[PDB]
Amino acid sequence: AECSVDIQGNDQMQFNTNAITVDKSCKQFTVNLSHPGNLPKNVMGHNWVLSTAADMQGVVTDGMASGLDKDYLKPDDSRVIAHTKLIGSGEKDSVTFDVSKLKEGEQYMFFCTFPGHSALMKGTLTLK
């Protein structure tokens, strides 16, 4: 029972991971994000943000409007279950969250909120 995952975000707006499965036995779950690209976060910044598939659009829409200084997230957005900070080339970050915030059945989606990235930088997350 692996309660963690390592993910990368490159210069071609791609996550090296497309689907995450969170085992029910896990009390917590950790995501380790890295950036193997060459570009800084102001132009190729990446974060790993988690929400229900149904809230993704709103989170992305509102986050992109909040600007860089706010890490492309609406301050105190209740639709955000968990998230890493926005990173650039050479940087990294990790996030751990309570698995009790997830439920069976329901589809979750991880994505980057940097302007336009969510088109390709997204994946699925499920509690199974």
Contact footprint for Cu ion (CB under 5 A)? 46, 112, 114, 117
Binding residues for Cu cation are 46, 112, 117, 121
Three-state SS letters, 20-63: EEECCCCCEEEEEEECCCCCCHHHHCECCEEEECCCHHHHHHHH
> Could you give the CA distance from residue 4 to residue 1 in angstroms, rounded to a whole number?
9
Closest separation between CB of residue 55 and Cu ion, Å? 18
Binding residues are 46, 112, 117, 121
Closest separation between CB of residue 53 and Cu ion, Å? 19
Closest separation between CB of residue 88 and Cu ion, Å? 10
The per-residue b/e assignment along 3-13, b for 16 or more CB within 10 angstroms, e otherwise, is: eebebbbbeeb
